[PDB]
Amino acid sequence: GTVNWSVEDIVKGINSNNLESQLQATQAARKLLSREKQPPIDNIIRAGLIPKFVSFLGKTDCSPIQFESAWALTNIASGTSEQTKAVVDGGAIPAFISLLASPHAHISEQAVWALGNIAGDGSAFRDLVIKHGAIDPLLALLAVPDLSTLACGYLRNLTWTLSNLCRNKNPAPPLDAVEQILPTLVRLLHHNDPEVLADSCWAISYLTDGPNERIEMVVKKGVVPQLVKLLGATELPIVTPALRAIGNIVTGTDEQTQKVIDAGALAVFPSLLTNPKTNIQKEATWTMSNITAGRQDQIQQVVNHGLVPFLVGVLSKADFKTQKEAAWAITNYTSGGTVEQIVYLVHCGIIEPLMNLLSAKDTKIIQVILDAISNIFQAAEKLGETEKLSIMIEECGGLDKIEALQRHENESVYKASLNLIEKYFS
Ligand SMILES: NCCCC[C@H](NC(=O)c1ccc(-c2cccnc2)cc1)C(N)=O
């Protein structure tokens, strides 16, 4: 029927003066554009078909050509930026917005998906979608008493598009737009479908990526407890964005950080710090590094929850990137912690795995480690145990690693090494 038409025929039919010939060629185009290996998007664009497609969006009298041209356009809009641009340039954005209120759910859904791909392309288009007024009719589609009545795929599409309106930076989305979408986002975050949950979490993790004021608008809606609950999901696609949102939040103030701790976050971290998926373990250790950068009573909760031996663990054996996150966690802990907390850290076994990392050929981790070693001696000098410490470090090959660092490209490293040898050794 409409399968494997040539571009030339599609053009011939869409140009005819026959609504039905056009409908038939438009469907042909959509099937061509829907093929999986190398769909001829640029050939379609070159033939000048986008303006014609955009006009069919307005044919309210012919519902099926609306759907078909919507789907065709959608396929193109899901390609490169240049391709997405051609769709926007054809004037698709207000036309798609008008279709959100289509009586046919298939058509309105298709518009949702298309606005999703356009906003998702980048900041400028995101903000252009918003200016043309997309947010209200998108939100209106979710104004039902119970989200469970909505079609499963329909609801996944809306959540996904909403998350693209939250998605990029430089600039971050308009404050006024974020405040408008957030209440519905809080609600989706409570909906019982794994995909809606994942997408909602991604949205929140976009909105929490930035300055503390941004973090505050989110934290103020009270989602932190639901984020922590989702942190313990079995589904890795829910846990990955939940962990990102949580990690973003603890880069903010001490008070925003305390919210995460109070919600029970720290109880999930023994799993997260030993998680078999390498990126979850990396994210969890980074998150820990921002927590040890906080208050002394916050360091104490890390301590109280038994997470210090997990940090020793990560430092001892992990992906190198995760180990560097572990280094930062320790330098932060040591610089801001009390003497008793630094003493405990050494009692848990921090020194040897710390020294083994001096071997690493990465200049900035070495300074982080040196930074941390110094902070520990400073605790020891308050207790006059600097000597006993020296021996620990010397027993586990720590000095051979420290002495070797003078013969080193960087001399902020050599100067840090230098000082340590004189001040605390013979
Ligand atoms: N109370 C001691 C906190 C240490 C100082 C404090 N530093 C931090 O908060 C911090 C510094 C560095 C990092 C970090 C950097 C690179 C990778 N992973 C973590 C995370 C947090 C500051 N710049 O104000």
Residue numbers in the entry: 72 to 497
The publication says:
Importin-α is a banana-shaped protein that is constructed from a series of 10 repeating structural motifs called armadillo repeats; it binds both the NLSs of nuclear import cargo proteins and TPX2 using sites on its inner concave surface. All NLSs bind to the major binding site, spanning armadillo repeats 1–4, and some also have a small additional contribution from the minor site, spanning repeats 6–8. TPX2, however, binds primarily to the minor site of importin-α, thereby offering an opportunity for selectivity. As the transport and mitotic roles of importin-α employ two different sites on the protein, the TPX2–importin-α interaction has potential as an anticancer target, provided selectivity for the minor site over the major site can be achieved.
Having established that the biaryl scaffold appears to be the source of selectivity for the minor site in this series of compounds, the crystal structures and docking results were used to design a variety of compounds to explore the structure–activity relationship (SAR) of various fragment–lysine connectivities. The aim was to minimise the strain around the lysine linkage, allowing the backbone flip and improving potency. The amide-linked compound 14 had Kd>10 mm by direct ITC, suggesting that its decreased flexibility was deleterious. X-ray co-crystal structures were solved for all the compounds 14–17 bound to importin-α with resolution in the range of 2.0–2.6 Å showing the resultant changes in lysine position and backbone alignment. The inclusion of a biaryl scaffold in all cases resulted in selectivity for the minor site, and overlay with the original fragment 1 suggested that these remained ‘anchors’ for the Glu396 interaction despite the changes to the lysine.
